[PDB]
Design a protein around this ligand. Structure first.
Ligand SMILES: NC(=O)c1ccc[n+]([C@@H]2O[C@H](COP(=O)([O-])OP(=O)(O)OC[C@H]3O[C@@H](n4cnc5c(N)ncnc54)[C@H](OP(=O)(O)O)[C@@H]3O)[C@@H](O)[C@H]2O)c1
Length: 326
């Protein structure tokens, strides 16, 4: 129990929608049936009012069941009290496919609408007749290059879903500054959120500015590092001695310190956990003192950026032209 927790703080998107600063990440590549339901229920009962989902996670049915059961067990809570965000995957970038994805997600979550609908990646890919990712002879995504660099159709579909009041806000994920310039050029409805990987080992400071200065709210996934360990040196963010020192001196958890850092920078954080204890503890986001904030920033600035989420080898498409040399 943290009375002064930032789990009550919200941000106001550029269309006036309120989004809780802390949201629960439901993606596990460990899914394992019943885990998503249990974790989502634990998060709702721990005080989370923000749920991050995605068609890619293939767990929206359990999330919807959890939401239904929670709302049924607590009459004082309404669906309007919850902020539900879901995303459309890469093979469904065709406008009809985008709409179908949103409808499928709504059916699974047992919701009439979502508060945030995000295009998961700026990469349109081909699909099979049964709405599965089409693999090529190399076993990698079959890229639709036309829809990939002139993504206006996709965004139009999103705008329509926005105007059909099926999504209260629409946005992008893993977008770049140049991609954002592209979309602004072509968009009628400016994206409200750009969900990206932000953490002390990948501060993403330049993109965080571009978004904030253009009325696009960043949303940080993998805010605790990730379920992944640094390849080039075998490092975990949550093992970093400086981060742990800052957390220990102020009698808070390392994850709490990282989440407070993120929220103090002014963006949303999406911690994920299957463990009940971590789900309870992650919601107790502290309002960092200036010393803790500056020291965490020191740790972040003393390092080579490290990006833990790069699916280059799966998509067969290098969005972020990052190489060993150079
Ligand atoms: N392209 C995208 O849009 C995108 C990509 C990736 C992720 N996301 C979103 O961001 C969310 C989180 O990103 P992530 O998957 O990299 O996970 P994360 O939030 O960065 O960190 C979670 C990892 O650290 C552990 N953990 C959680 N809380 C902890 C705590 N207090 N203390 C110690 N360990 C803790 C977790 O263990 P346990 O799981 O066992 O509890 C798990 O191993 C995802 O759920 C997803 O919603 C979006």
């Amino acid at each position: 129990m943290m009375p002064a927790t930032l789990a009550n703080k919200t941000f106001k998107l550029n269309n006036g929608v309120e989004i809780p600063a802390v949201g629960f990440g439901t993606f596990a590549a460990e899914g394992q049936p019943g885990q998503t339901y249990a974790a989502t229920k634990a998060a709702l009962e721990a005080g989370y009012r923000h749920l991050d989902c995605a068609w890619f996670a293939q767990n929206e049915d359990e999330i919807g069941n959890a939401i239904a059961d929670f709302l049924k067990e607590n009459p004082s809570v309404k669906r309007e009290d919850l902020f539900i965000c879901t995303k459309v995957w890469n093979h469904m970038h065709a406008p009809e496919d985008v709409k179908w994805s949103l409808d499928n997600s709504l059916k699974a979550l047992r919701l009439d609408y979502v508060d945030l609908f995000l295009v998961h990646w700026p990469i349109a890919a081909e699909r099979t007749e049964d709405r599965q990712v089409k693999l090529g002879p190399d076993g990698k995504y079959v890229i639709n290059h036309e829809l990939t660099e002139n993504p206006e159709p996709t965004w139009r579909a999103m705008e329509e879903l926005y105007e059909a009041k099926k999504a209260r806000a629409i946005g992008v994920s893993n977008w770049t500054i140049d991609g954002l310039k592209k979309l602004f050029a072509v968009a009628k409805v400016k994206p409200a959120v750009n969900q990206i990987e932000i953490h002390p080992y990948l501060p993403n400071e330049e993109l965080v500015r571009f978004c904030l200065d253009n009325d696009v709210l960043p949303s940080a996934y993998s805010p605790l590092g990730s379920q992944d360990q640094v390849p080039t040196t075998g490092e975990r963010v949550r093992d970093d001695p400086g981060l742990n020192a800052v957390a220990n001196r102020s009698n808070m958890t390392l994850a709490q310190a990282l989440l407070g850092w993120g929220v103090k920078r002014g963006y949303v954080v999406l911690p994920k956990s299957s463990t009940p204890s971590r789900i309870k503890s992650n919601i107790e986001v502290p309002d960092l003192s200036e010393a803790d904030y500056q020291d965490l920033w020191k740790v972040a600035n003393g390092r080579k950026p490290t990006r833990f989420v790069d699916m280059k080898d799966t998509f067969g498409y290098d969005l972020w032209k990052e190489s060993q040399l150079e």
